[PDB]
Amino acid sequence: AAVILESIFLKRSQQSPLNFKKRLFLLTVHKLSYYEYDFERGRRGSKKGSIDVEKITCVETVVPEKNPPPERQIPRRGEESSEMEQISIIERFPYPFQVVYDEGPLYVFSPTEELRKRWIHQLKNVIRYNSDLVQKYHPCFWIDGQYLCCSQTAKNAMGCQILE
Numbered sequence: 001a002a003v004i005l006e007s008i009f010l011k012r013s014q015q016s017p018l019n020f021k022k023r024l025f026l027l028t029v030h031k032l033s034y035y036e037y038d039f040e041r042g043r044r045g046s047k048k049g050s051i052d053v054e055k056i057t058c059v060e061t062v063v064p065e066k067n068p069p070p071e072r073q074i075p076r077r078g079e080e081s082s083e084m085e086q087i088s089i090i091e092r093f094p095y096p097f098q099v100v101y102d103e104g105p106l107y108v109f110s111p112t113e114e115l116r117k118r119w120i121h122q123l124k125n126v127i128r129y130n131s132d133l134v135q136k137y138h139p140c141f142w143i144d145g146q147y148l149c150c151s152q153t154a155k156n157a158m159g160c161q162i163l164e
């Protein structure tokens, strides 16, 4: 079923210290998938996983990390080169969004706000007919065994904030 979006994003892996990995994400009408990227040949490398779109309960932005490492900091502008600074789009991923399903949240970092907006808008569209949409979500990341927003310690805890 047609490719809706295809992007290189930094994702937080399921667990140990948190691990972030640069992966290609593919949205079709029924599946969200991710791949090791084959940079040299310009293709999808090895498929690493998939979830059914119909298992998604919620998709929203995530309050940014207070102390992000450089890989997730917003570029200052002109600190890399004099003009045409575009390679940041595969080097820096400071705009995070979350896909909630049964297991709890998947954290994905987008290199630009516009790309994050498109992914959220297209994800909301494809999950509109989902049976288990929640009207409550966590605005902050779950880190060190709890959600920063409400200190709850089940990854599948009901959201502490209502959705508009």
Ligand SMILES: O=C1Cc2cc(OC(F)(F)F)ccc2N1
Residues within 6 Å of the ligand: 011, 012, 013, 014, 032, 033, 034, 049, 050, 051, 106
């Ligand atoms: O380590 C990981 C990264 C990841 C992403 C994910 O969502 C998916 F497939 F991309 F839609 C589901 C499971 C996992 N486990």
Ligand SMILES: [Mg+2]
Residues within 6 Å of the ligand: 080, 087, 091
């Ligand atoms: Mg660089």
Ligand SMILES: [Zn+2]
Residues within 6 Å of the ligand: 137, 138, 139, 140, 147, 148, 149, 150, 151, 152, 159, 160, 161
């Ligand atoms: Zn919360």
